[PDB]
Design a protein around this ligand. Sequence first.
Ligand SMILES: *[C@@H]1O[C@H](CO)[C@@H](O[C@@H]2O[C@H](CO)[C@@H](O[C@@H]3O[C@H](CO[C@H]4O[C@H](CO)[C@@H](O)[C@H](O[C@H]5O[C@H](CO)[C@@H](O)[C@H](O)[C@@H]5O[C@H]5O[C@H](CO)[C@@H](O)[C@H](O)[C@@H]5O)[C@@H]4O)[C@@H](O)[C@H](O[C@H]4O[C@H](CO)[C@@H](O)[C@H](O)[C@@H]4O[C@H]4O[C@H](CO)[C@@H](O)[C@H](O)[C@@H]4O)[C@@H]3O)[C@H](O)[C@H]2NC(C)=O)[C@H](O)[C@H]1NC(C)=O
Ligand SMILES: COCCOc1cc(C(=O)N2C[C@@H]3[C@H]4CN(C(=O)c5ccc6[nH]nnc6c5)C[C@H]4[C@@H]3C2)nc2ccccc12
Ligand SMILES: [Ca+2]
Ligand SMILES: [Cl-]
Ligand SMILES: [K+]
Ligand code: NA
Ligand SMILES: [Zn+2]
Length: 806
Amino acid sequence: WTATSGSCKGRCFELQEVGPPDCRCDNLCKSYSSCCHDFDELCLKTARGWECTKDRCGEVRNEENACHCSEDCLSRGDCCTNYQVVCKGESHWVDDDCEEIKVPECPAGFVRPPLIIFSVDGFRASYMKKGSKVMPNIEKLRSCGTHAPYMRPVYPTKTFPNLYTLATGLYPESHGIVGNSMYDPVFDASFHLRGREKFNHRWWGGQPLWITATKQGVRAGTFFWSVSIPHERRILTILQWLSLPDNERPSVYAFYSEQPDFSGHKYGPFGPEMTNPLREIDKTVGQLMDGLKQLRLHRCVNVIFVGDHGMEDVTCDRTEFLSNYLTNVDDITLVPGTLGRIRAKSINNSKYDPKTIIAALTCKKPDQHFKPYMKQHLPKRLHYANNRRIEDIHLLVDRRWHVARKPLDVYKKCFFQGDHGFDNKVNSMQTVFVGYGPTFKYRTKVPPFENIELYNVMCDLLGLKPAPNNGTHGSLNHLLRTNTFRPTMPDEVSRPNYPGIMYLQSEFDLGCTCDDKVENKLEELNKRLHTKGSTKERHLLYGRPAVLYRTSYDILYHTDFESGYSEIFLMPLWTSYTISKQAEVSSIPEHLTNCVRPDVRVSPGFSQNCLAYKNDKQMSYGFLFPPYLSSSPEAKYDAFLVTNMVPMYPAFKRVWAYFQRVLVKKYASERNGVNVISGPIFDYNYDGLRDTEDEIKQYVEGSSIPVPTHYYSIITSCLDFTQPADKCDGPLSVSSFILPHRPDNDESCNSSEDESKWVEELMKMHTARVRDIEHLTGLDFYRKTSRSYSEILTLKTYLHTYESEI
Ligand SMILES: *[C@@H]1O[C@H](CO)[C@@H](O[C@@H]2O[C@H](CO)[C@@H](O[C@@H]3O[C@H](CO[C@H]4O[C@H](CO)[C@@H](O)[C@H](O[C@H]5O[C@H](CO)[C@@H](O)[C@H](O)[C@@H]5O[C@H]5O[C@H](CO)[C@@H](O)[C@H](O)[C@@H]5O)[C@@H]4O)[C@@H](O)[C@H](O[C@H]4O[C@H](CO)[C@@H](O)[C@H](O)[C@@H]4O[C@H]4O[C@H](CO)[C@@H](O)[C@H](O)[C@@H]4O)[C@@H]3O)[C@H](O)[C@H]2NC(C)=O)[C@H](O)[C@H]1NC(C)=O
Ligand SMILES: COCCOc1cc(C(=O)N2C[C@@H]3[C@H]4CN(C(=O)c5ccc6[nH]nnc6c5)C[C@H]4[C@@H]3C2)nc2ccccc12
Ligand SMILES: [Ca+2]
Ligand SMILES: [Cl-]
Ligand SMILES: [K+]
Ligand code: NA
Ligand SMILES: [Zn+2]
């Protein structure tokens, strides 16, 4: 119940929401069917439009007008945004030359530059170039401020997940808004675009920026605008708030435009109909900037122009139907469209089986336009699994396509020509970032970055401490003139042991054999040197990784590689080696095919054993430092140490062997040497975070050897490829991956072919940031470089995407 009999008199767009059943006058009352009876008449005036004209200049104030052109309007804070232009001979902001804003130039009474977030729905990154002719205000913000060529959204690339990620710095699996539509089985409740359930606070996890500000004594304008409030009225409301007394005035504001997304769905991302929506958004930016200029705020406020996601060409005819794959299509519920999520239609149905559903959806049709996954097998870069609202079965839909349950859903639910929601690496899903103001840099281009990073920066702009989030704070310091955040490296928690030779070969009873008993102070002096770390500078280029949790581990040195060997997990946490452009690939000699050698620095009790591998009929083994890249026949023996061995399914060994034998040398040739760090990852609860030992669900049969869920590699070289990876004077370049350690290659539909036709494609799908590997391993990399820590933070957030040019 709402008693709409009260009045909005003097309350129009009031900042605090009054509670039912008293009627509301805030920018959301429409959405709740709760506004006071006179809200339209008082608060949504439209009379005479939005622009001053020559004849209105100096007019008698008529309070009925949508905005004013009378002499008192500036002090009242309610002139039309073009008042000073039409009536006082001023220029539009867009027509002014840009001039660096070295310091904030604010009216007295302002404690900090305000932040205005101007968010545009469905604004594809390429609109900045492709639409530049029709967007002069936006182009001036872009060229004069700080901009990225594009900003990467989160998955799924839908409206609510991305807006709330922008507000919180959290992945959707952590903030809880994991789609535009959701079922939460614990609540037994459904979140829908239409209706009231979505207003309930239980859906919205984390701490969005307006709450962070409010808790730290910084007032916030509301971020939500009812759809029927016109854009012009939104801008005028912001401008009026900016004229409030100091004690009442917010410091952070948001504007939201439903365009260009609205038209993009109807016309496709580059339909000729799209030019007008772009022009209209630019006019709205112009209104804001002229309004700020009138208020003497245009060299005071920081403005962020940001989108949530892009827009792809998708039509009704490009739909895959599950009814062409499944016999039992009526026993499932599908969340459909540019992603799919499947669960049982009824929890009482004991014949429902996820394994048989997945198998019926796997590589069934030659050009099939979606791929099924159990959520824990999705690429770890999507961070899309640790939430009960994410169904176990997921369909990753190819760009340009939809998935639906049955044909009748597409015609009894072509209309649309555009959509979004696909994998967040897809070029068409990228979106925009521009920052303009005293706190941002002048005429500066920054590389692409992820939208999870922005919350920390918004916090920096407002002097707020950010709530715990998934950004890496400091990685966007290069966007800022001032207010940078200068973190310190995390403290190493566990120091390594440095074991020397402590065991005789006969103490080991591992069931391992090696043909190595074939026999000089010239070469015996040299091998002692190698085991003590004499080549360590060549193979450990950025310092050893720090271990950020409590554990017991050893540093092991070798001619060709160095490792941090875990006594708890019985294998390396990391193995580091450098391969020059000149390095040669050799084979595993026939006499050495099955060779495994005890490591006389490491106790039998802290070693793997070969018998467990023999007895485990599903599990084989591989090596972290590859025997193919040994520097010499004699150095190759080091590669077969029991301490370099890790468990690997035969199907995965196909992947691993091709990476090690073919791809590493290929990267060293292309990149002028590479440094490789490889290792295992254990994430059995799919939370993106390193498992403790008691979380491990699978061991090599009969042993305490834990099976990794993933294998990673971090591949670093010099950004200036004229310098070799091991003699690099300046910035670095990195690509990394986190490969799922699976007992089949069902993910790769072409896996019956030679590895040269499918392996690198799989690896590209499982591209990762160094930071993703840090979370998964509790390791901290790049501890000793010549580089600033913020620059290293940016490097750790980099993602090599393999998409062509934007
Ligand atoms: C991205 O950044 C985020 C933010 O930093 C990272 O997420 C954090 O990770 C921490 C570890 O997983 C986690 O810390 C836990 O907090 C528990 C208390 O949590 C509540 O309070 C906080 C603070 O206000 C709040 O934010 C939480 O909000 C979550 O839950 C509600 C649902 O009720 C949601 O609305 C909200 O969206 C959010 O959900 C997300 O996180 C939860 C886990 O909290 C997931 O389950 C969801 O799927 C979703 O992803 C909560 O309201 C605290 O109780 C935990 O401590 C337990 O476990 C530890 C083990 O180390 C142990 O020491 C404790 O004793 C305790 O154990 C007991 O409980 C166990 C489980 O019930 C049980 O098994 C035991 O036997 C014991 O009884 C723990 O400290 C933190 O909550 C989240 N925060 C957020 C916002 O998600 C995230 O990791 C980053 N991602 C990456 C990849 O880096
Ligand atoms: C970002 O700065 C200001 C805007 O901030 C925010 C504004 C809004 C905010 O006010 N809205 C209005 C619209 C809601 C309903 N809706 C749709 O009808 C819709 C829109 C486009 C679609 N494309 N495909 N399907 C679609 C469905 C999605 C949400 C859009 C976001 N909500 C937010 C929720 C959380 C965090 C912030 C928010
Ligand atoms: Ca884990
Ligand atoms: Cl969704
Ligand atoms: K085996
Ligand atoms: Na296959
Ligand atoms: Zn949309």
